[PDB]
Amino acid sequence: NASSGNRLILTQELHTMLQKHLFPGDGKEAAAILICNRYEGGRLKLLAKELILVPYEECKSRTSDFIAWPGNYLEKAIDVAEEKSMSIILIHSHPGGFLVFSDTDDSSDMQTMQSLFQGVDAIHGSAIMIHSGEMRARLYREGKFAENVELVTVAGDDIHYWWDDKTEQQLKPIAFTSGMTDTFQKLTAAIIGVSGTGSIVAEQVARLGFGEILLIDHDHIEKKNLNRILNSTLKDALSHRPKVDMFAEAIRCIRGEDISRPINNTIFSREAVLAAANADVLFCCVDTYLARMIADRIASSFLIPLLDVGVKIPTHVDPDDGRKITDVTGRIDYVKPGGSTLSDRLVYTPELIYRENLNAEEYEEQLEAPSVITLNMRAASACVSEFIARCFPFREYPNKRFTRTFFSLAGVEEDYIDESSITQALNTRLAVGGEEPLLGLPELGD
Amino acid sequence: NASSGNRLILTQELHTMLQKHLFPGDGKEAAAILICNRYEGGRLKLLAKELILVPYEECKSRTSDFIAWPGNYLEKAIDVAEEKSMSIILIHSHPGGFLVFSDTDDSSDMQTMQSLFQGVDAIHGSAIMIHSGEMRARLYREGKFAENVELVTVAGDDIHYWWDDKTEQQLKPIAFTSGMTDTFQKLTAAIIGVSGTGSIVAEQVARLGFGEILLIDHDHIEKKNLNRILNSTLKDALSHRPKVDMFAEAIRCIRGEDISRPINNTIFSREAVLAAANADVLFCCVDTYLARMIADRIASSFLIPLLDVGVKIPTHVDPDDGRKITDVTGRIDYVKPGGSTLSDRLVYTPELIYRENLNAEEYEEQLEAPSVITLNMRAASACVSEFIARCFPFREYPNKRFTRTFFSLAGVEEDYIDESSITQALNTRLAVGGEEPLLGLPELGD
Ligand code: NA
Ligand code: NA
Ligand SMILES: [Zn+2]
Ligand SMILES: [Zn+2]
């Protein structure tokens, strides 16, 4: 499938360190080793986890077109990878060259990939980088060539997609053009919540040409939903139709192809998490602290960029006038793997999740923003535009300045927070993939 | 129908003058006369055109609960109305009172309405105002009571809807609540252009609960349209389905009721103009100078508030990088009857319309914003929110400050222009209704 391609994902931080080591300035090849976890869902994703730099002095020969792999650094990589059968990717630079593997590279790989597989029974591979930072990679199974990596990607402040070469033109597209659609057609988007905002995110993702669209929601269409959920009908409400099934069918009719994957479940489930982990981008549109935390942990664990959107209309009672709107607000948060998280930004806290679960049990035992499509659309359009701006930069300022966006329609103000202003906690789950218990939550354990 | 109610429409300027005369501060009743044109479409609309203030000194008696109508001012009103059979509305104030017609008012009307009809064979009526400016009115046919006016309205910087009293609660609703839906259910919206922006405007108007939705467009769904037009399907494109018929059917399914009126024609037609003139609000979403001028003239002629929206993505070729986005922009203009127009704001000019028509003929004889739903949604959501903000004020600043809105997503700036900063030309077509040739354009003549 156009939505079954494999992935090698590096964090921005690891990629920056790698590029700096591979291009010291003397124009000679240099070497490094990436040790990766894997997620083997509908597509294979290699998740860069550890980096070993091969010192220049340790390489018996370094020239502008060759580097000798010191055997003991292969062994050091085997020693890191052995316990969890991690994938080992050997990387070298092509200063003054091109992103093409040479005959020497092929013949070297034939030797080194057999050594790596004898050390660790796992998929391994090799990669090359040019000075710009762009990479190509390929994988070897049982120590013998299997396949190129379709996509090497880094979701930084800007999102970088480096595609395996084809005979067709593959220039980076400009925002809002048809090359944009070409990129999106090879990507998978996950919509968490087919909500007031999420149905609008999903509509845009569909019409922008994304190749696979996961829809995650356990809720149903109701009469109260009809003022907000795109594509929903009165008939849908009268049969309490699941939101994900309604929207999957809409996408099928819009696109002429069954490219949506409806998951009728809460995001707090093994089913939803394992499906979402396959995606190339997460859009979190569920207005609970729990859901935002799950999305946060998926994004870190599986190295997926995350866009989180919320809106609010707080009200108060005025002594003289009665109930009044207090404010009308929206928030868009972009989270890059290894950058500050939703937790760091206090979008949720342990206490807020605790109180929210208690209140849900109180509401269960016992058993103001009613018409808000305009606000939902104002926020959801900004949310998807943020993804476009990071894939195909078009703003007059660096994308890092817009890491958080807050707007008020009552105060007619919009403010931006730069990534560098956000304190970061230690991120223990980065690139751990599906290590059990899933996301560190025993409730999701196997 | 809930969409067949009649209307008495005053301009903000006339209403302000009327209220000032009716409430000089001595707490005694005062009197004035409104002379109105009419539009008799699917609903009767009285369009306030001229105002005669009855001087306090000319009234034989003025008390806190009575005023004597001087007969010669009825004759002056007859003399103004005679040529074009205009409707005459007698207005007096209720200082310290309520918006209820008294027995004295009923008995007075029985006399004066017969005199008015003997003078001018037309519908006439009477109205009352309290100090706040709120009004009630009723109409007399052949000089005898016929019916109350369902809605007296002034579209100023704020939009005022004064509804005929019912046994049910009728408090002014707060933005984004259910009372909002109650107001909208009695209104007619006209969507000019079921375009990238117009289909999103129409979707919001539908789900917000508007009672009647006119859709005006001659264009069809095509494959190139599927990345932008809400509710459109591949099947729609394969049969080149008219946009208005596609969207009318969507609205029927969404709302469970056939409340849309699809007009498969250009706005530059007698059919479209006469349909639009029935509306309570115009949304202009067609990106031609001609269409914006027609909408401008409809709004002035029939006293309809107008929201005009456009977006642009100018591009340029960079010597070093190739084609680049120059800017990514949107514009929302609110036009109130008697306020500055789209012409005043140079949204179109005679020269721009002339050149546009020549280029269309050049293109005819001979025979960059391709994927832009996110921008269309960002602009269309702001456009409908602007209507909400003026009907149910919720901003921390006066609505007049936001008469024009300009935003750039590339420069990350949004600017507002106040009505008071815009120069106004003489507005010769204000409240002339369907005087021929329609809109002053011989091409639309009968
Ligand atoms: Na970090
Ligand atoms: Na004027
Ligand atoms: Zn090489
Ligand atoms: Zn009275």
How many angstroms separate the CA atoms of A33 and A48, rounded? 10
- In the block, tokens 């800007």 appear at A158
Contacts with B, A 419-438, CB within 8 Å = none
Look up the CATH number of the domain holding residue B190: 3.40.50.720
CB atoms within 10 A of CB B41: 16
Facing residue for A209 by CB, picked from B208, B227, B381? B227
Query: Which residues in chain B are contacts of A226 at CB distance < 8 A?
Result: 207, 254
- Domains of chain A: total: 2
Facing residue for A370 by CB, picked from B178, B373, B397? B178
Residue (of B414, B409, B376, B415) closest to B204 by Cα position: B376
Residue B199: alpha-carbon gap to chain centroid: 19
Which ligand is closest to the CA of B425, given by its number? 2
Tokens of B364: 């005819």
Domain shared by A27 and A121, yes or no: yes
In a domain, residue A240? The reply is: yes
In a domain, residue B409? The reply is: yes
Domain shared by A117 and A241, yes or no: no
Q: Which long-range contacts (CB under 8 A, 24 or more apart) does A415-418 make?
A: A416/B412
Domain shared by B159 and B209, yes or no: no
Vertex B373 angle, CA A372 and A304, to 5°:
85
User: How is A321-378 classified by DSSP, letter by letter?
Assistant: TEEEE---EEEEEEE-TTS--TTTTTSS-HHHHHHHHHHHHHHHHH---SS-HHHHHH
Tokens of B213: 């939705």
Tell me, yes or no, if A325 comes closer than 8 A to chain B by beta carbon: yes
Omega within 30 of 0 (cis) for the link into B437: yes
Nearest CA in chain B to A229: B207
Residue (of A74, A86, A83) closest to A33 by Cα position: A74
Contact between A335 and A296 (Cβ < 8 Å): yes
Three-state secondary structure call for residue B215? strand
Three-state secondary structure call for residue B265? coil
Vertex A237 angle, CA B383 and B178, to 5°:
45
Measured CA to CA in angstroms, residue A104 lies from A30, A66, A226, A329, B199 at distances of: 15, 8, 63, 59, 58
Domain shared by A110 and A227, yes or no: no
* CA B82 to ligand 4 centroid distance, Å: 26
Strand A7-10: give its sheet, edge to edge: A144-148, A135-141, A124-129, A87-93, A31-40, A44-54, A7-10, A151-155, A159-163
Measured CA to CA in angstroms, residue B211 lies from A209, B252, B281 at distances of: 34, 12, 12
Three-state secondary structure call for residue B167? coil
Contact between A59 and A68 (Cβ < 8 Å): yes
Q: Strands, E, within A197-295: which ranges?
A: 212-216, 260-263, 281-284
How many angstroms separate the CA atoms of B217 and B263, rounded? 7
Facing residue for B385 by CB, picked from A176, A378, A416? A378
How many angstroms separate the CA atoms of B122 and B118, rounded? 9
Nearest CA to CA, how far is B68 from chain A (Å)? 37
Domain shared by B272 and B305, yes or no: yes
Q: Which long-range contacts (CB under 8 A, 24 or more apart) does B82-87 make?
A: B82/B119, B82/B120, B84/B37, B85/B120, B85/B121, B85/B122, B86/B35, B86/B36, B86/B37, B86/B38, B86/B49, B86/B50, B86/B120, B86/B122, B87/B35, B87/B36, B87/B37, B87/B38, B87/B46, B87/B122, B87/B123, B87/B124, B87/B125
Contacts with B, A 85-124, CB within 8 Å = none
Q: Which amino acid is at A68?
A: A
Residue (of A291, A305, A300) closest to A198 by Cα position: A291
How many angstroms separate the CA atoms of B203 and B248, rounded? 10
- In the block, tokens 């009197």 appear at B31
Picking from A254, A309, A413 by the largest number of B CB atoms within 10 A of its own CB, the best residue to mutate is A254
Tokens of B174: 């707060």
* CA A281 to ligand 1 centroid distance, Å: 19
How many angstroms separate the CA atoms of A347 and A238, rounded? 35
Nearest CA to CA, how far is A374 from chain B (Å)? 5
Picking from B223, B259, B412, B416 by the largest number of A CB atoms within 10 A of its own CB, the best residue to mutate is B412
Facing residue for A371 by CB, picked from B178, B227, B394? B178
Range of the structural domain that residue A37 is part of: 7-163
How many angstroms separate the CA atoms of B110 and A103, rounded? 105
Tokens of B172: 């002014």
Domain shared by B139 and B251, yes or no: no
In a domain, residue B1? The reply is: no
Tell me, yes or no, if A172 comes closer than 8 A to chain B by beta carbon: no
Q: Tell which of A111, A129, A163 closes a domain.
A: A163
Tell me, yes or no, if B290 comes closer than 8 A to chain A by beta carbon: no
How many angstroms separate the CA atoms of B77 and A230, rounded? 53
In a domain, residue A2? The reply is: no
Vertex A202 angle, CA A199 and A206, to 5°:
140
In a domain, residue B172? The reply is: no
Q: Tell me the residues surrounding ligand 4 (ion) with CB < 5 Å.
A: B 102, 105
How many angstroms separate the CA atoms of A415 and A310, rounded? 15
Q: Tell which of B139, B163, B187 closes a domain.
A: B163
Domain shared by A413 and A281, yes or no: yes
Domain shared by A362 and A398, yes or no: yes
Facing residue for A328 by CB, picked from B323, B394, B410? B394
Domain shared by B186 and B153, yes or no: no
Helix (H), strand (E) at residue A87: strand A87-93
Tell me, yes or no, if B410 comes closer than 8 A to chain A by beta carbon: yes
- Strand A151-155 and strand A159-163: the pairing is antiparallel
Domain shared by A251 and A103, yes or no: no
Note the resolution in Å, 1 decimal. 1.8
Domain shared by B73 and B221, yes or no: no
Domain shared by B220 and B100, yes or no: no
Is the C-alpha dihedral spanning B295, B300, B304, B305 positive or negative?
A: positive
Nearest CA in chain A to B253: A233
Q: Which amino acid is at B419?
A: E
Nearest CA in chain A to B324: A174
Experimental method: X-ray
Q: Which long-range contacts (CB under 8 A, 24 or more apart) does B229-236 make?
A: B229/B194, B229/B195, B229/B196, B229/B199, B230/A203, B230/A230, B230/B199, B230/B200, B230/B202, B230/B203, B231/A231, B231/B199, B231/B203, B232/A254, B232/B199, B233/A253, B233/A254, B233/A256, B234/A253, B234/A254, B234/A255, B234/A256, B235/A253, B235/A256
How many angstroms separate the CA atoms of A68 and A58, rounded? 9
How many angstroms separate the CA atoms of A239 and B24, rounded? 60
Contact between B57 and B36 (Cβ < 8 Å): no
How many angstroms separate the CA atoms of B385 and B381, rounded? 6
User: How is B12-81 classified by DSSP, letter by letter?
Assistant: HHHHHHHHHHH--SS----EEEEEEEEEESSSEEEEEEEEEEE-GGG-S-EETTEE---HHHHHHHHHHH
Tell me, yes or no, if A324 comes closer than 8 A to chain B by beta carbon: yes
Q: Angle of helix B373-391 relative to helix A198-207, nearest 10 degrees?
A: 150
Tell me, yes or no, if A375 comes closer than 8 A to chain B by beta carbon: yes
Q: Which long-range contacts (CB under 8 A, 24 or more apart) does A97-102 make?
A: A97/A64, A97/A65, A97/A130, A98/A130, A99/A128, A99/A130, A99/A134, A99/A135, A99/A136, A99/A165, A100/A128, A100/A136, A101/A126, A101/A128, A101/A136, A101/A138, A102/A65
Query: Which residues in chain B are contacts of A410 at CB distance < 8 A?
Result: 394-396
- Is A204 within 8 Å of B254 when comparing Cβ atoms? no
How many angstroms separate the CA atoms of A272 and A267, rounded? 5
- Is B230 within 8 Å of A397 when comparing Cβ atoms? no
Three-state secondary structure call for residue A391? helix
* CA A67 to ligand 3 centroid distance, Å: 8
Q: Tell which of A123, A140, A163 closes a domain.
A: A163
Query: Which residues in chain A are contacts of B314 at CB distance < 8 A?
Result: none
- In the block, tokens 């909500």 appear at A195
How many angstroms separate the CA atoms of A206 and A202, rounded? 6
Contact between A311 and A330 (Cβ < 8 Å): yes
* CA B263 to ligand 2 centroid distance, Å: 30
Look up the CATH number of the domain holding residue B70: 3.40.140.10
Q: Which amino acid is at A309?
A: V
Q: Which amino acid is at B1?
A: N
In a domain, residue A168? The reply is: no
How many angstroms separate the CA atoms of A172 and B414, rounded? 29
How many angstroms separate the CA atoms of A158 and A145, rounded? 32
- Is A204 within 8 Å of B395 when comparing Cβ atoms? no
Vertex A122 angle, CA A119 and A123, to 5°:
120
Nearest CA in chain A to B410: A395
Which residues, other chains included, contact A345 with Cβ-Cβ below 8 Å and sequence gap of 6+? A333, A404, A422
Strand partners, B284: B192, B308
In a domain, residue B233? The reply is: yes
- Classify residue B220 by burial, with Cβ atoms within 10 Å: 0-12, 13-18, 19+: middle
In a domain, residue A142? The reply is: yes
Which ligand is closest to the CA of B98, given by its number? 4
